């Protein structure tokens, strides 16, 4: 119900999450924040949706496709989620 917009600097494990999606429902959604993570530090939670990656509109695009742009920007990503 809300939009949050935030931004991860990878850690020595990643940004401490990891995206599930449900079997051919469309979106892609976090499922495990690592406490003081990452993830968990920006603010993000489970099942918070994802909407933008780095500015980029992912809810028509396959859940593969949103874990690659995300494993695919480097030391930094910006999320567009709502939880």
């Given at each position: 119900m809300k939009p949050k917009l935030c931004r991860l600097a990878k850690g020595e494990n990643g940004y401490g999450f990891h995206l599930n999606a449900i079997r051919g429902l469309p979106g892609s959604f976090i499922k495990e924040v690592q406490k003081g993570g990452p993830a968990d530090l920006a603010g993000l939670e489970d099942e918070d949706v994802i909407i933008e990656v780095n500015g980029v509109?992912?809810?028509?695009?396959?859940y593969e496709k949103v874990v690659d742009r995300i494993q695919s920007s480097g030391k930094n990503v910006t999320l567009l989620v709502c939880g």
């Open positions: 509109n992912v809810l028509d695009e396959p």
